[PDB]
């Protein structure tokens, strides 16, 4: 992500020269720079997307823990029902 | 992400010709391609931001399961006290 | 991500003038606009990446709750074993 910020910084420096003394080779130089920055942006998006797979894994885990807690909650309610009935005995 | 990867590869080819034999219409053609690629980048960021709403949902669900586990742990300790107290009688 | 969508829309509007009557100052105008759009894209990616730290925090919390649910299940099983022993004897 720091690569991105630097890439953009180089791009602003090229644009700085271009706007002062315009030139065709500087226009092309600018476009090449833009492409390189775009290629890094795509790499970063690619990494964000692969990383975001964890959101799904966290989802499944939360859902599993929901179920486990439900089972334990029922077992404790059956245990409390066992004591209340046994204590009377 | 493949769509994004492809519009970048096209953009490399346009840039390829541009540097081989520079021209105005090629410069414009390149700028048009950059706009198209940026539009795809923006859609991808939009989808990433949309998709990332699930992180908020996960955190809330985690917080709720924390409360349930807190209640279940409290009752098990309340039950343990009951059993130990019963053993006396 | 509305700033992005507007920036891209401005960029498409400069691109219409460019393809209408090509010109050097318009080519530069377009490149400056592209740089600004990329700058916003980078900011957006930056924010997505910082936000995504919460995925790590959620993962840890889920792991913590897995351990607690495991201990609660063990304690409840040992309690069920105790009552069955007391009820018998
Ligand atoms: Br998450
Ligand atoms: Br959880």
Residue numbers in the entry:
A (entry chain A), B (entry chain B), C (entry chain C): 4 to 92
Publication passage describing the model:
Inspired by class I viral fusion proteins, such as influenza hemagglutinin, we chose homotrimeric helical bundles as the fundamental architecture. We decided on a design scheme with two divergent conformations containing a constant six-helix bundle “base” and a variable portion with three inner helices and three “flipping” helices. In the compact “short” state (∼66 Å height), the flipping helices fold back to interact with the inner helices; in the extended “long” state (∼100 Å height), they extend to form interactions with each other.
The interaction energy between the flipping helix and the inner helices in the short state was tuned by combining hydrogen bond layers (“A”) or hydrophobic layers (“X”) in different orders in each of three possible positions.
